[PDB]
Ligand SMILES: CC[C@H](NC(=O)[C@H](CC(C)C)NC(=O)OCc1ccccc1)[C@H](O)C(=O)NCCCn1cnc2c(N)ncnc21
Ligand SMILES: [Ca+2]
Ligand SMILES: [Ca+2]
Ligand SMILES: [Cl-]
């Protein structure tokens with residue numbers, strides 16, 4: 001059983017809030033500017049001034065903790081430098097077992113709701129249960145930071161809040177390492193690969209890792225400063241964490257081609273090269289493969305050939321667990 005971060009006891013706090021007829025407000029991570037940040041999100045910053053803390057039950061008549069499953073399309077980045085974290089959460093959703101260790105079952109805005117939620121993380125060398133109240137940063141009625149493509153779904157916003165809490169503020173999340181989030185969700189072992197020196201069996205390594213439910217992420221180093229822009233000519237984002245979400249082989253004019261699928265945690269802005277959603281390559285595979293694999297949607301998720309992947313990307317991170 002997870003031990004309680006700061007000694008805060010989820011079920012006890014929830015039960016006592018319900019008894020006392022109030023909603024939880026978290027003394028350890030309160031709905032004030034110091035929970036937002038210290039510089040870019042500090043008390044006197046332009047960003048801080050626009051933000052009002054509001055509960056999902058203040059925003060909507062029918063807020064939901066999870067809608068149609070806790071899945072990667074529920075991870076759409078907001079105005080914060082936490083792409084590394086969000087890439088990790090998106091990858092986490094592909095492994096139901098680990099997902100629901102981090103996101104406990106049984107949390108809702110209906111029966112038993114008292115304005116408090118909890119998540120479990122690997123921290124300080126322990127599995128720790130972290131509570132949050134459900135006051136969330138909003139501007140004009142919309143979440144400022146992470147949000148789901150399902151506008152009434154709140155689990156991922158609440159998990160990002162819990163992760164900010166253990167790190168001190170949302171601003172403390174700006175700029176980071178995907179592998180650190182992977183570890184914090186698993187207590188597993190992380191390794192990384194230099195794609196410009198890829199082992200010859202790297203694609204099989206990826207296949208095996210995906211099959212076992214390991215977490216995979218990738219990025220493109222900014223080698224100059226951000227000279228050729230943050231965005232490459234083919235619509236990739238440099239210095240930015242992507243989730244690796246599948247690896248599948250297709251038959252392209254009668255020959256096997258290894259593909260890899262990844263997802264930009266923005267939930268938008270995708271590769272426009274071969275195998276992209278609108279590319280001509282799809283016209284020359286088996287119709288069944290096309291139907292199974294290709295999804296024509298601006299959703300941040302796309303395929304690349306493994307060959308193009310290892311040319312365009314520079315780093316692959318893998319977190320292996322038990
Ligand atoms: C810094 C950028 C973030 N990148 C990083 O963290 C990188 C991640 C690695 C895997 C390359 N790491 C990093 O730099 O190390 C900094 C480091 C390491 C250790 C200690 C302190 C600082 C990330 O790209 C990000 O969060 N971008 C969000 C951009 C705003 N935005 C949000 N929605 C957007 C949208 N729809 N469209 C356009 N922009 C959007
Ligand atoms: Ca969902
Ligand atoms: Ca897509
Ligand atoms: Cl408390």
Ligand SMILES: [Cl-]
Nearest residue numbers: 032033043044
């Ligand atoms: Cl303030």
Ligand SMILES: [Cl-]
Nearest residue numbers: 064065108109
């Ligand atoms: Cl609910």
